[PDB]
Swiss-Prot record, chains A, B:
Residue ranges that the Swiss-Prot or TrEMBL entry lists as coiled coil: none
Organism the protein comes from: Saccharomyces cerevisiae (strain ATCC 204508 / S288c) (Baker's yeast)
Binding positions (CoA): R250, K553, R555
Domain of life the protein comes from: Eukaryota
Official protein name in the record: Acetyl-CoA carboxylase
Positions of the UniProt region annotated as Carboxyltransferase: 5-627
Induction: Repressed in presence of fatty acids. Repressed 3-fold by lipid precursors, inositol and choline, and also controlled by regulatory factors INO2, INO4 and OPI1.
Assembly with partners or alone: Homodimer.
Domain CoA carboxyltransferase C-terminal: 345-627
Subcellular location: Cytoplasm; Endoplasmic reticulum membrane
Effect upon mutating R555E: Affects only slightly binding of Co-A
Phenotype for L224I: Raises KM for malonyl-CoA by a factor of 20
Physiological role: Carries out three functions: biotin carboxyl carrier protein, biotin carboxylase and carboxyltransferase. Involved in the synthesis of very-long-chain fatty acid synthesis which is required to maintain a functional nuclear envelope. Required for acylation and vacuolar membrane association of VAC8 which is necessary to maintain a normal morphology of the vacuole.
Consequence recorded when altering R250S: Raises KM for malonyl-CoA by a factor of 15
């Protein structure tokens, strides 16, 4: 392409053109997408702020003579292996002074992005690099799976021991090498290339090959071993640092498993995540069952799956999303969650309010709702809601958000009925698309799964506190759902709660309720150390619902005894229904001590903003303590800390406690160093 | 029932009769079933051994004035709460000197086995009792879920504020109490029983009740709180001690969740595990959708589910199974796995051997097979195979077994095709039973799940080492299975491997193979600290299978170039197929260092018996070390230990290393105490 204003990048690095022909960004151009996505991130926070190019740095990482990773600046396309990495340091709204993370990616142009042992070694080496530093690990997947090959240096010289030269089709006994062959190999030091047993049959001296090894590396099982190496490496990383994967072109085999093992994944439309490919599958079934791999791993499969948390119209789009998702995550493992305050101050009422007699979208209660008569603010900061797993198990709504600047994970219940439409199985002539009516406020195996999954992804890497707008009638107990292991997924929820390490708020919203089974798996005693529960004054909760309570304790007979208040069943059965309901009031909860406080939705944002803030500070102090005595329970540590508050402080006053702490960090610190004489030997 | 030889137990304790009428054993008679099951356990080990009744002790546990559990001996039916517990100490074949465990159960006769807060408190108190001691916790579930009730002491005296006395059916404004009522309550100190706002309307002085609390405890949310308390308690216990649950009569709500949270569960035929019951569900759908709860939680639901690991023809049957399952579990958390040697010595060849050209039942390779020409021993001790999760995901076979006395978890691949038959959904007129062909040697979402589940249940509580007779072609990658999250369940496998704390052997059996994706999730590098892999000389393994390798690297053209060895495609394509295969040989694995050794099936039992034994001893030594320095990696600890072996010992000789260690425990011990001067201050 002659005469262009500036140099042709696809010509200086012809590999950049191949990448493009393959429908993906060339690996070396990715740090540029991040610098761009970072800049946008700034435009959106303060249109005014002036950015210098020194707000973003990218250094490629490569192994040195010792195999240790070091930074280098070399021309794109110099990579000798099919795996590349960059360490990135960027100043962002949440970390204006700078934050770092790593990017690892397949070079789709280097042997079609196949994973040979050397790639696996590099990928595992980069992952530990990140784990050790606690910084996030971003994997950009565009690969062909594990590398394969045969001992090509044996195909031209192998000889077959026919049954009779005359008619080959009669079969053969084995394969061998002539002295001539065994000789050729030795002239290239390639004797290890094969295992042969020497036995001479009448005519010539034949060497029967019993096993082909090949001089070339990356042919089989060694590629499989390296594969498992990184699968395990990723499994580990997910519990250690922030892990996220962008699929920019097909991702195969170990590639597909790496996407899931990292958990958090953003799939670019059209790029499939697959195990065995369509051609091969068809080839097996000897039929024309599938057309493209997208039928097997496109977004209509993985995004509906929960495997893919988000989709992206194109690469840059996915990057921006990663960059956005990261904006809620601590700079590095164990650092405080990044506070980011915006125009939507904490001090205000919650506008949008649900009504028992009219359907709403829980997202309104979360991020507010745009109205013709203006905008009604929701419970969280305007425009801070970052929903994830939106294509799967739509009974629940999960995402990140900000509460007066404080980032946290949010889980809400979708009250509207879901029309889950499952497409027919091509490999089965019978199969026909089925519609699944997933009724609102009811946990189903998939929505139970998503909830547990959400909590875990909030806890690992993200290390965020979380709020749950609990509002479920219960778990679906009919045959189909029960048969589909709904109990297993329900229990996953409890398990994730037991494992949670940050503050948790369980809050039953206004027209909401929490019944029997549902209340079980989310009750604060599941993890007293971090859980706290609140009920809105207009919520309801009890083992059963009025209809049920009467169906058991206010039967057909008892109703008559009260008919001694002077046919008329209709209005009396209604009286009993209302008699029960007076039992499920938040007031009773407070009385039975199963909730910390009853609240008023409109005033919620103010309460939670200071409750959360107070909590984060006390947690910070409990941790500082722990890194010393090494022997004391939470109940004792939190007590030693609260004994430091000025006598005049109301331990129950969140804002006050928080304020005194933030005004005395350095003073509280001195007291801790003063506790060094705590060396019990 | 007059004139019987001995006293009528159902009359002395009429509650025992109720229990029976309810189709279950009376709670107090359960320790007797255990003493019986224990005795059988002895008969089956040594028909000769004489047992005195002092080989089994059962002491009921109850809370004292401080709420602490203590042992008592009182008459059955004295329990003031609906929950009972017994501590059991029994001498058994594996622990002839005695072993202990706890039993907790619902009293189906005490308020229909409902969980009120007091029961929950007791159940949680018993669970910690066990966790602290590390002894197993056996839960016998027979319950009605969480307890419910209304403020009965308000139903006779509440008054309704009609719109007009004349016609009630016109509706009412609210409910209230007359001065007369408010007075009655005060004469019973039951004022807290209600929250009323006093406002007098023309006529009388009316107290409008805004919230009903009730003097009775165990009406609602307080029952829900206690429920979650134990769900979380069970969740925790499962990662701490050996947990197992027997369902002897329906198990509802929190009852159903406790069954799953404990994980290991044995369901007695006919007793359902359910959430909301059929009546209520029907009542909701306002239709006659379900007949019995067994449609919702019978064995045809939970056993096919994987929720129920085993079923039992009746109570005693379930007990025997628990008792048997426990025979492989350590006496208490962290004690050595119980060795139990029987007539089937370790020193022998493996008889039964699979053949590439004839279907077999992997169970034969495991526990041997009975033939007309005699019995052919399998890889493990004759009759020591205890299969579990047999009704679900039949693609894999999992169970416990013994190898020359050493107990371990076993996972085998079912080569036969499974005819998974799913029954139609009653709640759906369309629904019709579907047949699912699950082809052998292929992981499917359910068989992937079972495998991960097996590994985890082998690791937690059981604390057993494990062997995997790896032999899968790969994961099902077609649409249906891919769409059904097969990747999620596959990754669970890796996760469980990362978490494994005991020795692991991955062994590809004789006519077996391990291809691409399959090899990935089970490769030893996933957990080098505990994993070891072996390939039989007649197994195969590679990224692809020959058919595939040629379809890629030995195409239609290349085949012709080799046609230069003098239509005849058939036999040449066969040559290439065989050319590839010479690549997937165990010999190559050894060469590429991806396996520890290649083995001969018939000689396997001898090898593994000493490899496992050697390993258990070295592990024991690595642990002893750890409880000191507190700073040294495995690679360094195992090295300090092996530096103690006599110069003349072949570190690679399992039997020798094991023998020198068992002959020097006390001497090795002295050396460790000598390392006390390792107090780095
Ligand atoms: C297919 C399916 C299966 C189970 C489902 C369960 C629920 C939530 C449940 C519904 C049942 N429930 C009740 O309080 C309830 C009832 C609730 C609404 C109408 C009638 C009811 C009758 C009952 C009779 C006896 C005991 C309880 C009853 C508690 C909360 C919601 C949707 C469900 N969908
Ligand atoms: C519904 C379904 C979907 C996917 C499945 C996958 C397997 C195991 C796979 C089968 C595919 N495979 C092969 O080595 C293979 C082949 C294996 C057997 C016959 C033909 C093959 C053609 C291939 C062409 C290109 C690449 C690989 C091929 C590796 C192991 C087994 C059963 C499966 N069932």
């Amino acid at each position: 392409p002659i005469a262009t204003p500036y140099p042709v990048k696809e010509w200086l690095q012809p590999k950049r053109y191949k990448a493009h022909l393959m429908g993906t960004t060339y690996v070396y151009d990715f740090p540029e997408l991040f610098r761009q996505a970072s800049s946008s991130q700034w435009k959106n926070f303060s249109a005014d702020v002036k950015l210098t190019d020194d707000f973003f740095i990218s250094n490629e990482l490569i192994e040195d003579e010792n195999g240790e990773l070091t930074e280098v600046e070399r021309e794109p396309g110099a990579n000798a292996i099919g795996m590349v990495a960059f360490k990135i340091t960027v100043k962002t709204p949440e970390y204006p002074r700078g934050r770092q993370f790593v990017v690892v990616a397949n070079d789709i142009t280097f042997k079609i992005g196949s994973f040979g042992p050397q790639e696996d070694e590099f990928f595992n080496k980069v992952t530990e690099y990140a784990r050790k530093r606690g910084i996030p690990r971003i994997y950009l997947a565009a690969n062909s799976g594990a590398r394969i090959g045969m001992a090509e240096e044996i195909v031209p010289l192998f000889q077959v021991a026919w049954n009779d030269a005359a008619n080959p089709d009669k079969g053969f006994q084995y394969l061998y090498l002539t002295s001539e062959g065994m000789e050729t190999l030795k002239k290239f030091d390639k004797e290890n290339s094969v295992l042969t047993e020497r036995t001479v049959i009448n005519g010539e001296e034949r060497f029967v090959i019993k096993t082909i090894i090949g001089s070339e590396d990356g042919l089989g099982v060694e590629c499989l071993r390296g594969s498992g190496l990184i699968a395990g490496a990723t499994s580990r990383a997910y519990h250690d640092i922030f892990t996220i994967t962008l699929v920019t072109c097909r991702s195969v085999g170990i590639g597909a498993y790496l996407v899931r093992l990292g958990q958090r994944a953003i799939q670019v439309e059209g790029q499939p995540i697959i195990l065995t490919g369509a051609p091969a599958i068809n080839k097996m079934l000897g039929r024309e069952v599938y057309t493209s791999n997208l039928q097997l791993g496109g977004t209509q499969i993985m995004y509906n799956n929960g495997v893919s948390h988000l989709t992206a119209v194109d690469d840059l789009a996915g990057v921006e999303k990663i960059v956005e998702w990261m904006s809620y995550v601590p700079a590095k493992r164990n650092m405080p969650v990044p506070i980011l305050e915006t125009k939507d101050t904490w001090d205000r009422p919650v506008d949008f309010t649900p009504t028992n007699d009219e359907t709403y979208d829980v997202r309104w209660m979360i991020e507010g709702r745009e109205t013709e008569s203006g905008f009604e603010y929701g419970l969280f900061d305007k425009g801070s809601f970052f929903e994830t797993l939106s294509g799967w198990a739509k009974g629940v709504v999960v995402g990140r958000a900000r509460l007066g600047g404080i980032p946290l994970g949010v889980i809400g219940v979708e009250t509207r009925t879901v029309e889950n439409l499952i497409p027919a199985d091509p490999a089965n002539p019978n199969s026909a698309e089925t519609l699944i009516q997933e009724p609102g406020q009811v946990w189903h195996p998939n929505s139970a799964f998503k909830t547990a999954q959400a909590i875990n992804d909030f806890n690992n890497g993200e290390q965020l506190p979380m709020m749950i707008l609990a509002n479920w009638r219960g778990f679906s107990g009919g045959q189909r759902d029960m048969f589909n292991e709904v109990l297993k997924y329900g229990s996953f929820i409890v398990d994730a709660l037991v494992d949670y390490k940050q503050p948790i708020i369980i809050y039953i919203p206004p027209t909401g309720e929490l019944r029997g089974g549902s209340w079980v798996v989310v009750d604060p005693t599941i993890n007293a150390d971090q859980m706290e529960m609140y009920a809105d004054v207009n919520a309801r909760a009890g083992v059963l619902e009025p209809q049920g309570m009467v169906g058991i304790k206010f039967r057909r007979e008892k109703l008559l005894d009260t008919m001694n208040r002077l046919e008329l069943l209709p209005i009396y059965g209604q009286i009993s229904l209302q008699f029960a309901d007076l039992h499920d009031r938040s007031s009773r909860m407070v009385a039975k001590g199963v909730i910390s406080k009853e609240l008023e939705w409109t005033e919620a944002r103010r309460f939670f903003f200071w409750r959360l803030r107070r909590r984060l500070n006390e947690e910070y102090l409990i941790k500082r303590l722990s890194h010393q005595v090494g022997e004391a329970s939470r109940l004792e540590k939190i007590a030693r800390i609260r004994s430091w508050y000025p006598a005049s402080v109301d331990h129950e006053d969140d804002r006050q406690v928080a304020t005194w702490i933030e005004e005395n960090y350095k003073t509280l610190d001195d007291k801790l160093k003063g506790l060094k004489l705590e060396s019990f030997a």
